[model samples]
Target: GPSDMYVHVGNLIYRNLHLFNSEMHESILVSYSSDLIIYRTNTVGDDYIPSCDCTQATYYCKHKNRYFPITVTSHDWYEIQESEYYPKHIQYNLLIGEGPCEPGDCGGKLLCKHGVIGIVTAGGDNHVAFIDLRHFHCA
Candidate 1:
């Protein structure tokens, strides 16, 4: 079951939705420049999603262990862009999902303009619950 965690930003304590094993890891670090707010992983491992360009010979699509479709809601019109780093555009209707810890397998990160509200991991066998970040407020 998912649990609620506290992130103290200045004087206000922001409540964040934490999924299974939420207490097992450190808080997700949030940083911002002028245009983007970056969420960085605390521990380093094989977290980057794999990608390959089979058709155009261009490095566009990621070749991960698995892929799933996800839907998100935001204020502005979004474009869905795939990348090894930050996604280039806001993906509409579907998203490439990836998943539960596997050897040599990695998980990819998602980026949005307003913020990510929901996400479903790739692979059908896994039973991990979807993460909903819609209610989260930004400072």
Candidate 2:
């Protein structure tokens, strides 16, 4: 079933959705061609992620076994995965017969009252996480 989660995800059921926090989404330059990409991972709550380090000002990514701090360019970011608030409406129609966005793969989108909701290959990962972003001594 469709859920009004703080962060709705997946390809088939996540084509249409919304996040209220100003930092729900992010974009990145994926290649040397300057090709744009979304900032997402399949491992938001993954085990490999280190705790949030307030001393650092970047998202740490792991390639192989090494952690690399990411530059969070606010450029072209969206609000589909941010803070909490009155989520009176969402792209609950995020399924095959649910609405505009269907239960297919590759990519799709839907329109929220506040803005446009969409989904792309946010990509998978050997991921990591931190409960707090402002209080961590670990790296």
Candidate 3:
């Protein structure tokens, strides 16, 4: 049986340096409402360390550390129905990760078990758009 759990809501900021030029890159500023929660890996460098080569994989940089400013919101009970435990319904928002771009605008959709959570845009034409989960009656 699953027990009740607490959910936290917050923002995530990632900073990395390009291996070749050592140029610092700041990820897009993401905003979330009270219902949203965010989490990120310990360091952007971790992803590069596994497959990076100081001799060849030149464009790989190691990150310092991962940080998550989780804001505990509320708690809800978990219930089992029809032999399956169902998560209590709660409002939440997730930032669709960013994509690489040379100079033009780029956008992508956020994925969730429920569906495409929302859309995010970065680069020259900076914009982030999200849809209200309440608008959809999805399970």
Candidate 4:
């Protein structure tokens, strides 16, 4: 049930409904297009993602088994997949980048120097799809 949901941000544990006070929640509003964030694997205990605005593209993406630096090719890519088993649209509301991403990389951050621009929604076929943070909401 929704009542059982919660999140851990920094040193505190918050019920999902009360996460509005967390840094991620507050920091999310500071994001915008083409922002920069250092590329790093989303791993355990790496819970905090501070906003950033680096000078150049510092990203490496994997295609099949090879890793190469990549860039955002289009910030206006949009698509949605509807699963019959689900009640809502599965959107790839993304900033498409020039790289390959598998479903395993979903939820990874698309970051820039100013803040997180978005998170990997889904990817495949030599392209990566990112969902921008501007559409994020706490509810």
Candidate 5:
């Protein structure tokens, strides 16, 4: 789960992710939210590291002056789900482990996990979203 003060994206599929790096007080812009879900190799980064990343695997995510372990959820990118939320050619997915959730943005869709990333599809737009979870790494 996320901090109660965290932003709630609701169910409005987002694209183009801005991951917050807490200690640095900055964020990493990336494509797709799918990669955010896998954290700690046993957890999801977005929820555990959202003060998250700028891009790409295994790095420390900061929060409240503390650094924590977080990394890219998947090694490869897959295909993004098709929908009215986005145009096809620009979307794709990367498996963020086998951890389960609310069957497609239904439960805690978390943060950018519902988004699509990449240049052509980026279209460079902004949206609402946000996280941090760990300890047995419940998701």
Candidate 6:
């Protein structure tokens, strides 16, 4: 049953990628809360390697009680130290260019066009910081 759902969501993501990556913004009509569900390959111990290319992402906002699959771009990456709220092991980085992720948005997954890359850790102004899944292993 879940496999069926995964395949369905996979197709939806593919269609979205076609419209999103291609430049066909006019026909990008994807609307399903089910797409917000977490999808993992279960490839244990496989670290997320960073790609030079950039892509958009989707993440849920708890305060708004909705998912923000906005056209946001991840242009930078970095780590945190001596933190108060976040842990040292989880590598956090900035996600700029669109999406309004606030306080309640933390712990959300940063699902990019390529794949699930990070987790929403914190935010400031219009940008938000997410834990780089690459540092750990899988999303």
**4 versus 6: better TM-score goes to:** 6
Over the stretch 11-103, how does candidate 6's per-residue lDDT look in tens digits? 222121211333333333322211112223323322233443445666666666666775555534454332334444333244544567654
The candidate maximizing lDDT is 6
What digit string (tens of lDDT, one per residue) describes model 2 on residues 24-78? 2543212111111334555442122123312222221222222233212111222
Give the candidate number with the greatest TM-score. 6
lDDT of 4 by residue, 15-130 (tens): 21112223444332322221212221233232333433232222323333333344664444455342222223334334666666654454445555544445555555776666
Best-to-worst order by lDDT is 6, 4, 1, 5, 2, 3
Answer with 2 or 6, whichever has the higher lDDT.
6
Report residue 117 deviation for candidate 1 (angstroms). 3.2
Pairs of residues at least 3 apart in sequence or in different chains that clash in candidate 4: 35-112, 36-112, 36-113, 37-111, 37-112, 52-113, 52-114, 53-113, 53-114, 54-113
Tens-place lDDT per residue, model 5, 1-139, is 2322222233222222322223222332223343222211222234222332233322111222222222234323344444434444323343232222221231232333322221111112221111222111223
Please give the TM-score that candidate 4 achieves against the real structure.
0.43
Compute the lDDT of residue 16 as modeled in candidate 3. 12
Report the candidate with higher lDDT, 5 versus 6.
6
Clashing pairs in 6: none
C-alpha RMSD between model 4 and the true structure? 10.5
Q: What clash count goes with each model?
A: 11, 6, 2, 10, 16, 0
Models, CA RMSD each: 14.2, 17.8, 20.6, 10.5, 14.9, 14.3
Error of 5 at 30 (Å): 4.2
Tens-place lDDT per residue, model 1, 1-139, is 0111222223322222222234324334321110112233343332122231111111111344343343322223233233333335442223333334222121222323332233332222332122222323332
Candidate 3 local Cα displacement, residue 118, angstroms: 1.5
Assess candidate 4 and give its lDDT.
0.39
